[PDB]
């Protein structure tokens with residue numbers, strides 16, 4: 001039983017920008033989701049060894065999680081808000097792929113995804 005290396009949070013050869021929207025994605029969007037009662041399963045990479053989900057990384061090949069997202073934001077990893085929104089989308093999609101409608105974890109993800117969409121419906125203007 002082996003977890004893979006977690007996604008990178010720094011990369012010196014990737015272009016980065018400090019954007020008004022990206023600051024909002026950390027200050028408001030991430031930080032708010034993080035405090036939700038259903039946030040905890042998503043706050044770190046899936047440890048398939050601890051959770052005894054040995055088939056997880058047999059199935060999920062582009063893992064993502066809010067802890068990785070938060071580190072990427074704090075580390076100025078992204079060029080634009082769409083890159084970071086894509087990571088959120090990968091996180092939710094992975095959960096929907098591995099699990100089935102009605103599972104507790106899927107109900108948690110559905111609730112978080114709706115809050116996430118509410119929060120990104122309106123982003124600060126790329127002044």
Ligand SMILES: CCN1C(=O)c2cccc3c(S(=O)(=O)N4CCCC4)ccc1c23
Pocket residue numbers: 041042046051053094095098099104105
């Ligand atoms: C979001 C990533 N991710 C999955 O795809 C997934 C599948 C089955 C269980 C779990 C757990 S758990 O065991 O702590 N759990 C919390 C609620 C249900 C059970 C935490 C995080 C998980 C899973």
